[PDB]
Design a protein around this ligand. Structure first.
Ligand SMILES: O=C(CN(CCO)S(=O)(=O)c1ccc(-c2ccccc2)cc1)NO
Ligand SMILES: [Ca+2]
Ligand SMILES: [Ca+2]
Ligand SMILES: [Zn+2]
Ligand SMILES: [Zn+2]
Length: 161
């Protein structure tokens, strides 16, 4: 049990969207990803807009010159930060892509969950069922989507025993 600067309560801010799909896709994805950890660990969060909350989820169009420019439908889709004094819980989403909620392309729900897990203080895992797996698995089985012992231990080290 050792979370972000020992803080149990983290605030998140939505500063991203999707040009392809509706706003339910992006807003609910961030919250479902944010709360997917809430449904697994006793973490506390709040969604606001002030200026900059703990976790800041922003969009990144082709002018993405902070790490990698737009790649279109490439294998890369997002990047996030966690153990930092400033970049604490901050991520970016490739705007130039087909963000979808049904796995029809760039699953923004799975990606957000994976990005949120990163921002919370976790890196990559090894199990194929793990939400923190280094590969976006085209798993059409959204009825079997869940957290696994692999990523579970990762978030457990953060907010658990
Ligand atoms: O993981 C990433 C981005 N990627 C590079 C990792 O090598 S990726 O290839 O775009 C990517 C995207 C999504 C997922 C993913 C999403 C949901 C569940 C499991 C994996 C894994 C990698 N950033 O933290
Ligand atoms: Ca891409
Ligand atoms: Ca931050
Ligand atoms: Zn970026
Ligand atoms: Zn990752």
């Amino acid at each position: 049990g050792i979370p972000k600067w020992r803080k149990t309560h983290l605030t998140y801010r939505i500063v991203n969207y999707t040009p392809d799909l509706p706003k339910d896709a992006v807003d609910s994805a961030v919250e479902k990803a944010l709360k997917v950890w809430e449904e697994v660990t006793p973490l506390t969060f709040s969604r606001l807009y002030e200026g900059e909350a703990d976790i800041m989820i922003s969009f990144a169009v082709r002018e993405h010159g902070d790490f990698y420019p737009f790649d279109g439908p490439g294998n890369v889709l997002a990047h996030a930060y966690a153990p930092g004094p400033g970049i604490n819980g901050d991520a970016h989403f490739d705007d130039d892509e087909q963000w979808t909620k049904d796995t029809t392309g760039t699953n923004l729900f799975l990606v957000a969950a994976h990005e949120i897990g990163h921002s919370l203080g976790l890196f990559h895992s090894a199990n194929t069922e793990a939400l923190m797996y280094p590969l976006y698995h085209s798993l059409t089985d959204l009825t079997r989507f869940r957290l696994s012992q692999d990523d579970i231990n990762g978030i457990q080290s953060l907010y658990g025993p």
